[PDB]
């Protein structure tokens, strides 16, 4: 059995920064360090940081006065930022810069009172944080997930309308949604393509190349990772069996029995150790040396705030 490894895979620049923000805060200030939401949607990273003294909360009212608070990579609404601001907290912001970029545009549209449409998945913390940048009652902020959503949306003034996207979407599905928006609202303004980040685009492109070669694709990542789920979905849509797994213990032998070629990748929030252990388990089930596929080079790094070292 040939084990193939997707390239690029695993940590992106935002996730490396965000985890380093929490670890450095723990090292500089000691436990506890409060984090609003899982810093990244990975169970291994999250359990790890919990055992080291980070406490993960959903609301600022869970956080004691005087505490250090870090916002997760996904970002936070103005309401949350202000509730934190109004309380007695030292705040470090681990929001990915590439999320912050979208935030600034929704804020712009809000200040103008011009309506904005977000493409994204209801209930995801990044969507809550992005929708949460708009506050002007004179305009409006709308969520669409699909072409059918666009087909039913009415806005107040379609001569002044813009759109933004969640950073972790399916590149192909988002393209359908944008085509629908431009047909329904011919004057809508957006970025040249979308707000899907470099890391989501690359890892999708990588998993397409993997799925071309592999009968079975394992995507290392947690159930609540949006970008990880998009990798598994892409492979499955190409007619390959695909599984999203937290770690090597999730592997069922039937998945790989009599399979000549298995592919492995990882979501942007999955550490490389998890992938090494998955390969190790596939080697127990008959795999050889893991072969990495050639991939698009990534060279972006995002530094932690100077205050955190």
Ligand X SMILES: O=CCCCOP(=O)(O)OP(=O)(O)O
Binding site for ligand X (CB under 6 A): 14-15, 40-41, 73-74, 96, 99, 126, 167-168, 225-228, 267-269
Query: In this complex, which beta carbon is closest to ligand SF4, that of residue 168 or of residue 174?
Result: 168
- Min dist CB 229 to ligand X, Å, is 8
Does 222 belong to an annotated binding site? no
Query: Which one, 125 or 139, has the nearer CB to ligand SF4?
Result: 125
Return residues touching ligand SF4 (CB under 6 A). Answer: 12-15, 73, 96, 98-99, 167-168, 197, 199-200, 227, 268
With beta carbons less than 8 A apart as the criterion, state whether 33 and 26 touch. yes
User: How many CB atoms within 10 Å of residue 10?
Assistant: 24
| CB nearer ligand SF4, residue 21 or residue 96 | 96
Smallest separation, CB 112 to ligand X (Å): 26
Which does residue 161 touch among ligand SF4, ligand X, none (CB within 5 to 8 A, set by kind)? none
Residue 13 binds which entry of ligand X, ligand SF4, none, CB below 5-8 Å type-dependent: ligand SF4
- Please pick, among 105, 115, 126, 128, the residue that the annotation labels catalytic: 126
Choice between 125 and 140, CB closer to ligand X: 125
Shortest distance, CB of residue 164 to ligand SF4, whole angstroms? 13
Q: Is 27:306 a contact under the CB 8 Å cutoff?
A: no
Q: Is 74 annotated as a binding residue?
A: yes
Q: What is the rounded distance in angstroms from the CA atom of residue 269 to the CA atom of residue 246?
A: 11
Residue 33 touches which member of ligand SF4, ligand X, none, C-beta under 5-8 Å by kind = none
Parallel, antiparallel or unpaired: strands 290-292 and 2-5: parallel
Which of ligand SF4, ligand X, none does residue 262 bind to, with CB < 5 to 8 Å depending on kind? none
128: annotated active-site residue: no
Is 226 within any annotated ligand binding site? Answer: yes
Of residues 24 and 166, the one with the C-beta less far from ligand SF4: 166
Give min distance, CB of 38 to ligand SF4, in A. Answer: 13
Shortest distance in whole angstroms from residue 75 CB to ligand SF4: 9
Strands 33-36 and 68-71 come out as parallel
Binding-site members for [4Fe-4S] cluster are 12, 96, 197
- Residues classed as catalytic: 126
């Amino acid at each position: 059995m040939q084990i193939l490894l997707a390239n690029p895979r695993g940590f992106c620049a935002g996730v490396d920064r965000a985890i380093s923000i929490v670890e450095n805060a723990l090292a500089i200030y000691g436990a506890p360090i409060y984090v609003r939401h899982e810093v990244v949607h990975n169970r291994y990273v999250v359990d790890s940081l919990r055992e080291r003294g980070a406490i993960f909360i959903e609301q600022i009212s869970e956080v004691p006065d005087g505490a250090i608070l870090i916002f997760s990579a996904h970002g936070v609404s103005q309401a949350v930022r202000n509730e934190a601001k109004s309380r007695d907290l030292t705040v470090f912001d681990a929001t990915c810069p590439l999320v912050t970029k979208v935030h600034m545009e929704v804020a712009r549209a809000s200040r103008r009172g011009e309506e904005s449409i977000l493409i994204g998945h209801a209930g995801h913390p990044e969507v809550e944080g992005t929708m949460g940048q708009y506050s002007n009652p004179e305009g409006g902020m709308y969520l669409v997930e699909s072409p059918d959503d666009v087909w039913k949306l009415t806005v107040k003034n379609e001569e002044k309308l813009s759109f933004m996207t969640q950073t972790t979407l399916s590149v192909d599905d988002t393209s359908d949604v944008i085509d629908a928006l431009r047909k329904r609202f011919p004057k809508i303004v957006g970025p040249r393509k979308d707000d899907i980040c470099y890391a989501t685009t690359n890892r999708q492109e990588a998993v397409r190349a993997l799925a071309e070669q592999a009968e079975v694709v394992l995507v290392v990542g947690s159930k609540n990772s949006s970008n990880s789920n998009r990798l598994a979905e892409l492979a499955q849509r190409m007619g390959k069996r695909a599984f999203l797994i937290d770690d090597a213990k999730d592997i069922q032998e039937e998945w790989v029995k009599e399979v000549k070629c298995v592919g492995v990748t990882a979501g942007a929030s999955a550490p490389d150790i998890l992938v090494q252990n998955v390969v190790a388990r596939l080697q127990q089930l008959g795999g050889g040396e893991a072969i990495p596929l050639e991939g698009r080079e990534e060279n972006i790094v995002f530094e932690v705030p100077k205050e955190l070292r």
